[PDB]
């Protein structure tokens, strides 16, 4: 199949400023009929996809003319002259020149802001949960930027866990940060076989991880 390569995966943008994203195909999308069937869609959070651009550069009726599509053959570009809040979402390019129809992986537009280190909090199992024979240790990694982050669990100093459940928020509508929750879930029995429980957050804001621990007690 024709491979549609979108770059970057995530574009940081600023409201009122231009943006540009690339879509390149593994073979020319110039059809033998003379047309180039290169398309752009926008999918906003919680919404269905919407057509933006068809035939490389044609705007769908009603679509803001701040959007411009360009390119030829294998190399295409979607430009936004001035980014607005409504423009945030995932852009997909897709080709209809060669069956099967194929999509790019999407590029996500997010808002640029200043770097921020995570605020890390660790919570031992609650008494209520322990009563039921369970033991979840919860770690929040809150309000950081940029979005990439790594969490590691250690028990008595050794990289190790059991049931780890990770969840990540979308960009915060208030401060443009990101947050993560990581839950390590053991039986009460297993929880009691170890002492030190540690959540380690690694983020570009520091060469050294943020380490939060408690000793069961």
């Amino acid at each position: 199949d024709v491979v549609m390569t979108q770059t970057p995966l995530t574009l940081s943008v600023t409201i009122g400023q231009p943006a540009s994203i690339s879509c390149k195909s593994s073979q020319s999308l110039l059809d033998s009929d003379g047309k180039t069937y290169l398309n752009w869609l926008l999918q906003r959070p919680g919404q269905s996809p919407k057509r933006l651009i068809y035939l490389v550069s044609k705007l769908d009726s009603g679509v803001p003319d701040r959007f411009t599509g360009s390119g030829s053959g294998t190399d295409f570009t979607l430009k936004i002259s001035r980014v607005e809040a409504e423009d945030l979402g995932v852009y997909y390019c897709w080709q209809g020149t060669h069956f099967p129809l194929t999509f790019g992986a999407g590029t996500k537009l997010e808002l640029k802001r200043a770097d921020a280190a995570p605020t890390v909090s660790i919570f031992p199992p609650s008494s209520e949960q322990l009563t039921s024979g369970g033991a979840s240790v919860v770690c929040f990694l809150n309000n950081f930027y940029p979005k990439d982050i790594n969490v590691k669990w250690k028990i008595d100093g050794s990289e190790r866990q059991n049931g780890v459940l990770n969840s990540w928020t979308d960009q915060d509508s208030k401060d443009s940060t990101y947050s993560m929750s990581s839950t390590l879930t053991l039986t009460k029995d297993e929880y009691e076989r170890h002492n030190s429980y540690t959540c380690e957050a690694t983020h570009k804001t520091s060469t050294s991880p943020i380490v939060k621990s408690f000793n069961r007690n």
Binding site: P49, Y92, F140, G163, S167, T183
Partner: protein, 218 residues
Amino acid sequence: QIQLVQSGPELKKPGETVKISCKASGYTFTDYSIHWVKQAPGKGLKWMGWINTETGEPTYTDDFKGRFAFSLESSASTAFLQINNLKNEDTATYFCARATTATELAYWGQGTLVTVSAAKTTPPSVYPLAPGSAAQTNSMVTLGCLVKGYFPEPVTVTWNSGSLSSGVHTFPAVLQSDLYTLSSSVTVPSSTWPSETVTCNVAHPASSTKVDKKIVPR
């Protein structure tokens, strides 16, 4: 004016069948092909194939051979997608789209979410997340609630009945098993809690439950 309207969400068990509809209006139904597109939760878009609305002939990509059937009721301007022998990995939003001469995917339906699960309706356990009474404090303190082991989605989490929201993070639900778990954090001034009460309120409409958990030093 051109519209594709899709049927509502479906919950099915593995091995069952689902049939979803895509009703068109605002144009001549039999003049343009209908395409189907799958989007697994949090993933991208994948083309399934199309049905010719004149001939009725469906064509599937090889990924969608076997268990998938496109059909029409042309007199009702409706296209259908049926999925047989449902599998967990069929959980996804399915979109119908209509072609134009310039583009196969010109006008899009709003999607139909198909959830495949053997889970039964289960209310969440709600556990408090608090610092210890003698923990060292700063200007702000972070509290939370663990909302564990429920089905189906959604739950709604609120803090002090909605009075605390500016400092709230409620994390998207994730499958821990066949059940969901989520967590919610709230950060407030240390001069605010424990001096005033902070309570997480967790509603699970499907099980007719609403749990309140007061956060106390712990």
